[PDB]
Amino acid sequence: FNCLGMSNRDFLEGATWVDVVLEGDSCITIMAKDKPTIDIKMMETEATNLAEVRSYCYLATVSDVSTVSNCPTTGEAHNPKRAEDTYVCKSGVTDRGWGNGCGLFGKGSIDTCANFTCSLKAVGRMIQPENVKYEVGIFIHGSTSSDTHGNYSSQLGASQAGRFTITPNSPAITVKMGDYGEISVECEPRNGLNTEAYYIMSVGTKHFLVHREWFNDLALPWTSPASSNWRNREILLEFEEPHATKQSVVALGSQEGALHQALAGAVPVSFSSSVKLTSGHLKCRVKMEKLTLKGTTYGMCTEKFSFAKNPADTGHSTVVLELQYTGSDGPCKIPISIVASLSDLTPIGRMVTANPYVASSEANAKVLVEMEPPFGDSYIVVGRGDKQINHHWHKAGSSIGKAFITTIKGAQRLAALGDPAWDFGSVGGIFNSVGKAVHQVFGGAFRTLFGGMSWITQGLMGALLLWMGVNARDRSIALVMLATGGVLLFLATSVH
Amino acid sequence: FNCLGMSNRDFLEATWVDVVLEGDSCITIMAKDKPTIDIKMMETEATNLAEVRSYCYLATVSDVSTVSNCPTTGEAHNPKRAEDTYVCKSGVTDRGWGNGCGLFGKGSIDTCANFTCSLKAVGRMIQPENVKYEVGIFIHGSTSSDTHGNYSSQLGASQAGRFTITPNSPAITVKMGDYGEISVECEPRNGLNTEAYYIMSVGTKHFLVHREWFNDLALPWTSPASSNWRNREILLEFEEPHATKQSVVALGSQEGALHQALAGAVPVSFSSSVKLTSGHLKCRVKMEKLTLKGTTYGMCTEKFSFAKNPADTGHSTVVLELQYTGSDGPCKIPISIVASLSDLTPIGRMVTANPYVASSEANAKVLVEMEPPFGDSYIVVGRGDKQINHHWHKAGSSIGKAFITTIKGAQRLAALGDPAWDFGSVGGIFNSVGKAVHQVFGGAFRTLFGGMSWITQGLMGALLLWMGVNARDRSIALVMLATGGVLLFLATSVH
Amino acid sequence: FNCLGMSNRDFLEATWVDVVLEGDSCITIMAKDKPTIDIKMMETEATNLAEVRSYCYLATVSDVSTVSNCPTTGEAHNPKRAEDTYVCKSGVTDRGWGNGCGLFGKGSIDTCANFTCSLKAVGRMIQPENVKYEVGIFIHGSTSSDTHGNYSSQLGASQAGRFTITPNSPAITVKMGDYGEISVECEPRNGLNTEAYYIMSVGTKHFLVHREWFNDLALPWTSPASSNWRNREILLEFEEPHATKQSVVALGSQEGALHQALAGAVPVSFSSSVKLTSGHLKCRVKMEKLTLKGTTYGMCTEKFSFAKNPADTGHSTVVLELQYTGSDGPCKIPISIVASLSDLTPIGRMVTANPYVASSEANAKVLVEMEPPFGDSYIVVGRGDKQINHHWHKAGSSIGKAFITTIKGAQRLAALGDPAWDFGSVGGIFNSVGKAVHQVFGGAFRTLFGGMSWITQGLMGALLLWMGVNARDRSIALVMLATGGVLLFLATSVH
Amino acid sequence: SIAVQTHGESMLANKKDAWLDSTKASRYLMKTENWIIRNPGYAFVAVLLGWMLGSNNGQRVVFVVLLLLVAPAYS
Amino acid sequence: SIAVQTHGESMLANKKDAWLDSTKASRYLMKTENWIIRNPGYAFVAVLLGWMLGSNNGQRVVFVVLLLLVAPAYS
Amino acid sequence: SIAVQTHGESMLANKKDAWLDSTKASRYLMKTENWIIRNPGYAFVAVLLGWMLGSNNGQRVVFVVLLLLVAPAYS
Ligand SMILES: CCCCCCCCCCCCCCCCCC(=O)O[C@@H](COC(=O)CCCCCCCCCCCCCCC)COP(=O)(O)OCC[N+](C)(C)C
Ligand SMILES: CCCCCCCCCCCCCCCCCC(=O)O[C@@H](COC(=O)CCCCCCCCCCCCCCC)COP(=O)(O)OCC[N+](C)(C)C
Ligand SMILES: CCCCCCCCCCCCCCCCCC(=O)O[C@@H](COC(=O)CCCCCCCCCCCCCCC)COP(=O)(O)OCC[N+](C)(C)C
Ligand SMILES: CCCCCCCCCCCCCCCCCC(=O)N[C@@H](COP(=O)(O)OCC[N+](C)(C)C)[C@H](C)O
Ligand SMILES: CCCCCCCCCCCCCCCCCC(=O)N[C@@H](COP(=O)(O)OCC[N+](C)(C)C)[C@H](C)O
Ligand SMILES: CCCCCCCCCCCCCCCCCC(=O)N[C@@H](COP(=O)(O)OCC[N+](C)(C)C)[C@H](C)O
Ligand SMILES: *[C@@H]1O[C@H](CO)[C@@H](O)[C@H](O)[C@H]1NC(C)=O
Ligand SMILES: *[C@@H]1O[C@H](CO)[C@@H](O)[C@H](O)[C@H]1NC(C)=O
Ligand SMILES: *[C@@H]1O[C@H](CO)[C@@H](O)[C@H](O)[C@H]1NC(C)=O
Ligand SMILES: *[C@@H]1O[C@H](CO)[C@@H](O)[C@H](O)[C@H]1NC(C)=O
Ligand SMILES: *[C@@H]1O[C@H](CO)[C@@H](O)[C@H](O)[C@H]1NC(C)=O
Incomplete structure (x- = not known):
């Protein structure tokens, strides 16, 4: 729901709505003038009612083997086990003469049949579009410490965050964010996961999100969902050198490892009676016309602050710090800014914590403030006069x-x-x-x-x-x- | 030891001849004034095999552990890294104030998982002095069709020999009764290139693989009686670093992939000694001490009958089995192939050198093989009013x-x-x-x-x-x- | 904190000035209507150091075992290669019937020797927020010779201030009694580029070294608190093989070679925290609240004498010490630099601006230091009978x-x-x-x-x-x- | 991957069938023709491209075949 | 076989690693580099055949590269 | 560590002498001494090749100095 310790997030300037593309494991922070800065992220996506489309064998077994033999020029051998469905049969030819059995020398036809059993199979299922279920988190920056910024049991208890479900049935939802108002979002779950170019392939306990053409092209003995008879069984069988009366058949070893090699590039999912994966994208549109500022009439805090937790780079050319407030007064605005120098104290940076404040009246409060300074040398200033405390920050990049x-x-x-x-x-x-x-x-x-x-x-x-x-x-x-x-x-x- | 009923049969014609006994082939030699010879390599045996390397195609992971680290400490070190049976990888996860670090960025993790091998594919090597070839030699004397392939009886007739050719016994001469002596000298060292082959065992399947292919094989491997595996990460997947505990999963059995890789290798047997019916062996066959009988018995005068009618062998030769009714001692068999029943001059070549009834018993069966010419001919058995004429057409041309x-x-x-x-x-x-x-x-x-x-x-x-x-x-x-x-x-x- | 006798001194000249506080230098600021300012960076400090890598420069070999394999019976695999504290190497040796083998050729050996690091050089990293610069500021008030350099007196005179500058406190104002307020605002992140240095502690010597050079060292090394060394074979030598037992010798201490490789690294002191005395620091010093001393007393009436003769500071400024015979409380000194004694127009600008005697007690020594022009000049104290003169020549030219x-x-x-x-x-x-x-x-x-x-x-x-x-x-x-x-x-x- | 690296024709003289000789023709061509069937557009663009950088009809078809074989391999 | 017919990159928009991303660079080139290393003679004949087919230097090197690529893949 | 991995001049603003600054002149050129002294014939031959690899008289000096500096550095 919240994106502070997350490697990849994007920043979006504000006018009443904006459409975004919530990606797999990224987040978006939306800064707007005279709006609370909010972050939105697609935590996961889900499927719930999957119906089998195919099965593939990768461990087959030969049960009993028979060879029907005919003398040379007597025609073609025909094993009666060709009329039974669970038997794989192949016609070969072996040398025959007086020492073998027959009265004529030459190539006599034989027919070998082996009973085919499948031990382990990989099951390919599909997703109906009306069952994808995106989990989406939205959070308003507000006034958080560092031990509650990502809890969500405190962010929900302070009306600053919400996780909610997006479904093709209900592509839009509104979240009540307390004094901030309402935040709305209408998504495109149908235009989300393609869900018509993918299967869920289960091999043992490993489940993958495979392409449909690739899954359809495996060279393995396959079968219909409910069926039991297989097709292309000869892929897993070897008929050795023919023998006049007893030609043997061997089943090849488990192709589970070969299948895993074939699955290179597939997206691993976690099927636990419901497919859960944390990738893809979902295009949404967020409305923040009902989103307002909280405490426009608090006023500034009077007593001195401190750096309860040193400023830290976040990797996105942004800084975060945590101030402890000695004041016992109630809620109040934090007099904090980014300046080019401690002389000529004009703000030059933009702050993404959206008008921070000390939301409590009990003393020793701790407030996480997170702001984006410019390139070069800057000063974080909070307080004035003797109580003014300062911090030198440097940003390495260039425009x-x-x-x-x-x-x-x-x-x-x-x-x-x-x-x-x-x-x-x-x-x-x-x-x-x-x-x-x-x-x-x-x-x-x-x-x-x-x-x-x-x-x-x-x-x-x-x-x-x-x-x-x-x-x-x-x-x-x-x-x-x-x-x-x-x-x-x-x-x-x-x-x- | 003899080749009647083999699809691979060759025919050869001053006193020795150089032959190459192939795997499932046979050689028939017909000299100027010598009995017909059948020589064949049958079976190759290797007796003492030394293990070289074992590849793991099934592994299991037992105990996975992860140590996380903040971006302010550098790489992490899992304590189990100092244990032999553990595979360890250094991954990188996202770290920040939420996880418990002081700074934001990428923190280091080290994940170690146990590695037990379940099934290994053992590879073995052949020593040239442990290589045995089995060679069968046979002289076309007097046999019935059922006796024609029985060594227990051809030995008793002194018409056959089964012998082992080794580097320490490269030459064997075998007694042949009244036909003389037949000798062979062979070079076993040039036969099977042991310096380019291995015997891989995958369960209960054994192959003859190239050394260069076996060495390049990409699986965890161990030396003989070492139990310390190398490149085990081939059968392992380290996935999705989590900054608390990362799951490590072994891949499936490689046995099917191994069999797919083996597509082209020659299967062999292995019952403490590798058997093999392929390959070749160069020999020199010495007939100088070999000769014909030197006496003739005199024509059989009783009636003849076909115990088995003339049958093509598929090699432009016709075989039949006569039955002699009378019991008048050993006698010469009147049999020939002629162009017409007017000019009874023989025209073909007799694979059985001089057919004769070996025993003095009634209903004696004798197998005779001929090489008729292309076109129309007649098999003539007996003379007078006991004569049997069998028209025979040999299709083809020279x-x-x-x-x-x-x-x-x-x-x-x-x-x-x-x-x-x-x-x-x-x-x-x-x-x-x-x-x-x-x-x-x-x-x-x-x-x-x-x-x-x-x-x-x-x-x-x-x-x-x-x-x-x-x-x-x-x-x-x-x-x-x-x-x-x-x-x-x-x-x-x-x- | 103080600047006289420095050999690295700079002079500067509408309310603030931007300076660089080089580590072994000093800056003197001489504004229009302001006291003269002495500003210097005394030392940089770093308190919390985190290890990043330890390099072994002295190892030990204890238990050496060699296993050997016949020339074509596989590759030797030492059991201790399972263990992790052992460095193992595979070699080839001459083998034959003389040697235990059955074939003549190049047999294989695997040698493993236990590894033990005795001494390590530890590299720590400085977090930029734990860097603090120690800064001295000084007002050129009335000082003696024994006090101009004693901090426990200048602080007692509200005449100097020695303060700490951190990223969390880049600016500070110093109380200077009657002189007003001097404020300084610095950039404690651009001074020491902690992102490009390590502190390496070899023995009791500690060095500020570059990151890339530290990361290019060719020695066995570990991650911090790991003890799982790698590239251990740098410190070991394998002699010629013997197929039953081989010798492994650790190369001697690399402390000397490490000291040689450190040629150019900056020595530091790391008793409990790192203390550097080099570097630089960029600070703006603002003087708007700095006022010339509010003085109600007049010129001294009694005689003056040279308690210490004029001396040449190496920066074209003279320094001398006057002796006051009188005891009439605080009083300003009538000292000047003129071109000739017949015309007493003051021409040399003063660096000890507004010199005066502080105490009411007689025999007061007062250090006055000045900047005369090039060529000849005269230092004059008093007038008339009480006048004392001193000729001074300043060699050089503008x-x-x-x-x-x-x-x-x-x-x-x-x-x-x-x-x-x-x-x-x-x-x-x-x-x-x-x-x-x-x-x-x-x-x-x-x-x-x-x-x-x-x-x-x-x-x-x-x-x-x-x-x-x-x-x-x-x-x-x-x-x-x-x-x-x-x-x-x-x-x-x-x- | 071990299955991709295949023990080819054995140098041993053999008048029989090797381990997997039923798939000798297929195993070297199945994936290429399958990929071509799934990617006709590449076939067309490769045919078009082989004409560009050739110099005569002789050596344009060679380019076309070389491109048509080099892409299904290496995916 | 089925190992040669690899899945490939997923059309899904991902930022984690896929199933066997640790071989995303290796598996395509492992067989080719092994074949070139263990049949060094073929490099010479491919070089000469390309240098003779190609009208100009660029055509020559393109021929050589495609020749060095298509042989170790179907062999 | 191997002493050819010399830390060199530090990028820190410094006014003392760094570690072993008495040898700045020597340690960068001492090895070329006690080698040219022991191998004058190489100096002769290097001058000879410098005089013949340089089309211009201003190329011979550059080649000769380059050779007389590059050979001792790699023994
Ligand atoms: C008269 C006019 C003047 C011009 C005269 C031109 C003369 C040209 C003659 C060319 C002769 C070429 C001979 C090539 C022999 C290649 C043999 C070979 O590759 O050996 C293989 C076997 O290969 C063959 O059997 C190929 C035989 C090819 C013979 C080609 C003869 C061409 C004759 C050309 C006649 C020129 C006509 C002149 C008129 C203009 C055996 O391999 P091993 O490594 O020993 O064992 C492993 C076995 N295996 C590879 C199969 C797995
Ligand atoms: C005198 C006037 C000259 C005018 C010249 C104009 C030239 C402008 C051409 C600029 C084209 C650049 C477009 C690059 C975008 C690349 C985007 C990308 O990442 O690739 C896309 C596709 O990229 C494209 O196909 C981009 C378009 C092709 C390039 C267009 C060239 C047009 C040239 C115009 C020339 C005009 C000349 C006029 C002369 C008078 C990936 O495929 P998707 O469909 O997004 O699916 C993603 C899934 N998957 C990763 C599996 C592929
Ligand atoms: C015709 C039009 C008029 C053009 C007027 C051109 C005027 C240009 C004047 C340039 C004077 C440069 C003097 C530089 C003095 C600084 C000291 C020095 O030489 O050392 C520098 C030398 O490095 C430099 O090169 C940077 C100094 C600035 C150089 C600026 C040159 C500009 C030339 C412009 C040419 C004009 C072209 C006109 C075209 C019509 C070291 O600096 P860093 O590299 O930052 O330090 C790190 C290295 N170390 C550890 C060793 C300390
Ligand atoms: C007669 C004269 C004729 C003149 C002809 C003129 C031809 C001009 C053709 C120029 C085409 C260039 C196209 C590529 C530009 C870089 C775009 C880019 O990749 N960069 C984007 C990425 O933005 P995001 O990823 O944040 O959002 C994504 C949303 N978005 C892509 C809609 C912005 C921007 C700048 O950051
Ligand atoms: C004006 C210009 C005139 C130009 C004239 C042109 C003349 C061209 C004539 C070319 C004929 C070449 C025929 C060679 C066939 C080789 C196949 C072969 O080896 N076959 C052998 C018999 O095979 P074997 O099974 O006994 O094998 C063992 C035989 N060995 C030991 C001899 C190898 C014979 C030759 O068929
Ligand atoms: C036909 C027409 C021909 C006319 C051509 C005439 C050309 C003559 C022009 C010569 C001008 C050269 C001046 C620049 C070189 C000296 C640089 C230097 O380092 N010197 C500085 C001493 O500065 P500091 O380090 O004390 O203070 C710090 C101040 N800083 C950071 C700005 C340097 C000054 C300028 O000297
Ligand atoms: C043949 O296999 C089927 C399942 O495929 C099994 O039910 C049956 O018992 C087997 N029959 C024999 C003769 O083994
Ligand atoms: C959130 O804070 C509550 C206390 O209000 C605590 O019970 C819970 O464990 C916290 N959750 C997390 C994820 O830290
Ligand atoms: C071979 O002949 C012996 C002796 O008559 C007989 O007992 C046996 O059954 C025969 N064996 C074979 C191989 O048929
Ligand atoms: C091997 O060295 C280790 C430390 O690396 C030491 O603890 C151990 O005692 C040594 N093994 C022997 C010789 O017992
Ligand atoms: C500084 O002066 C004080 C007077 O309180 C004196 O006690 C002390 O010895 C002096 N210190 C130094 C460093 O000379």
């Missing part, structure tokens, strides 16, 4: 470097989500409305031509496209190949 | 015979390599220059196209034909066409 | 002094880099844009020649000068000449 980082984050977000990435922080407008519509056609033209391809193959194909485009003429086909080769290399390096 | 023997020669060159020039060889100069050229060409060919499977051989050969046709130098074109033809032959021949 | 100032500024620019532009800075557009253009070409040059040494720098500077003076293009022949000049400057800087 152009941050622009490059944001550019590559956006490029790989387009890679991750494709078209829904154009709905990340959008406020409408023709620019996004046409960017989505052109990314759709370009993605189709790119996916019919380079889908189902690994990073090495696409990297080499892109390198060849660069070579060709440099040697290309007419300057019109050149740039197309340059763009495609750039994209293929970006994709090939985006995962290493 | 041109087709030559073509099929050329194909067999090419296949022997492919499967046997250089010893193919030692087959039916009598030390000719042509064989020596051909063999010497074959080493220098099949070294260069093999060092380049040695690891190629049939499909890539076919593609490479087709490309070479194309390039040689488009080649202009007229000498790079010749050699490129030659190599491309070899590649197409090796690709198509095994299908 | 035109020459500009050269020394420029070279000292260049040395500061080399030593400080970018913060050198904040030295003596008061706002400014040229100064800020110079700092900005020094950001670029400061790291642009660094990424090309940061890791070089002085001799490498000099050879590169000479080669760039050669190519530039030959270069046809005037655009490229100026940048290359500039790099050649700066590289030779940085080479000669160490001398």
